[PDB]
Amino acid sequence: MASRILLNNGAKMPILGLGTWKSPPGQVTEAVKVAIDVGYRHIDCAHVYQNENEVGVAIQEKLREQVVKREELFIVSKLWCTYHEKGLVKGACQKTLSDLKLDYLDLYLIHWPTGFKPGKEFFPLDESGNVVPSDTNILDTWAAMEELVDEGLVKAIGISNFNHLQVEMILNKPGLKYKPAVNQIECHPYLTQEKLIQYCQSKGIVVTAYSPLGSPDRPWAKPEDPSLLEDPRIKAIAAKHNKTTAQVLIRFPMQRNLVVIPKSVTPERIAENFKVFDFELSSQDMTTLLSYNRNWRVCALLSCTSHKDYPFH
Numbered sequence: 001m002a003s004r005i006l007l008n009n010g011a012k013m014p015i016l017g018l019g020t021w022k023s024p025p026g027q028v029t030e031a032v033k034v035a036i037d038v039g040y041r042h043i044d045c046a047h048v049y050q051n052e053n054e055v056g057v058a059i060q061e062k063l064r065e066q067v068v069k070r071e072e073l074f075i076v077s078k079l080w081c082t083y084h085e086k087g088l089v090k091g092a093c094q095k096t097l098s099d100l101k102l103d104y105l106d107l108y109l110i111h112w113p114t115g116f117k118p119g120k121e122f123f124p125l126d127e128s129g130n131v132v133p134s135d136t137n138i139l140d141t142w143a144a145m146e147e148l149v150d151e152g153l154v155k156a157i158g159i160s161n162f163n164h165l166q167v168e169m170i171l172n173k174p175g176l177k178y179k180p181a182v183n184q185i186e187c188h189p190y191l192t193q194e195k196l197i198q199y200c201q202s203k204g205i206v207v208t209a210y211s212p213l214g215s216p217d218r219p220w221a222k223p224e225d226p227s228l229l230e231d232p233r234i235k236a237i238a239a240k241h242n243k244t245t246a247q248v249l250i251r252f253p254m255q256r257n258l259v260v261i262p263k264s265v266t267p268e269r270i271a272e273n274f275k276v277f278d279f280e281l282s283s284q285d286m287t288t289l290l291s292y293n294r295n296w297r298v299c300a301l302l303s304c305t306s307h308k309d310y311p312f313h
């Protein structure tokens, strides 16, 4: 399979990237170094992950070493919810750029449609346990993202965790200057997303699938939750193809014309997870994997369920 997908800004995006949420700061520099050595050319980052400085150390070394050229890398980050105000967006982007050791991002995403009150805390909460919102809306935040393109800080802009009506709101924004290039959403056999994916693809927006392995290291995991990597039905498909369950879970979104961003800090798994361009799932395999949908979310943003822009009602 071809390694890159064409975006609606004219640039090409690698379909397989390395995730970095929960990657410990003392391990993520190695992880990114190994990833680049074994062929990864796309790294998914975010300010809220608190490890962009350490990701950047790896990127800069590999650029300095001439293992890879900057134009061959595709670095993605995300604007956190406490920076949706017009006057904070540029500085948030520039902090991410400084930390990552870059003079531009390939893609910058609005991390969630929900804006929160600015300040030091990433989740300002009230006594109900609900977030303190910002009176920003997705459309003014989008205009601020468009400015970043026009200042040369980012090559592409996009969105994350936007539902169908929120994507449509952006696409229908009065005076829209740049369409979103990407919508990054949770997607795996237990949350298959047929409706939102077809809508985005029909508009030329590329979808990136996050938590493709079901995020077994998510901090709020409960033992009774379903487990993709341990699902016997998925293990059986992997065995038939002489691949690992993770490799099946990564190949699955690729064959739906999605980008996918599995996270690992384990060198062997980083290498294994990239070895997914040597085999094909059948159409029957694809439909079988789709049949496992149960609308189960790793990331439900539960402290924000009363925010006006909460995406998952």
Ligand SMILES: NC(=O)c1ccc[n+]([C@@H]2O[C@H](COP(=O)([O-])OP(=O)(O)OC[C@H]3O[C@@H](n4cnc5c(N)ncnc54)[C@H](OP(=O)(O)O)[C@@H]3O)[C@@H](O)[C@H]2O)c1
Pocket (backbone or CB within 6 Å): 018, 019, 020, 021, 022, 044, 045, 111, 160, 161, 184, 185, 209, 210, 211, 212, 213, 214, 215, 216, 217, 218, 229, 244, 246, 247, 261, 262, 263, 264, 265, 266, 269, 270, 272, 273, 298, 299
């Ligand atoms: N936009 C958003 O709101 C949002 C939300 C969630 C995630 N994301 C992005 O998507 C990325 C991926 O999602 P995720 O981190 O939630 O989870 P994930 O990629 O579904 O799963 C990561 C977990 O799987 C393990 N793992 C990796 N490869 C494996 C393999 N071959 N065999 C067995 N276990 C394996 C990792 O362990 P080790 O690391 O110990 O090897 C880690 O515990 C994130 O890191 C982040 O970049 C974005």
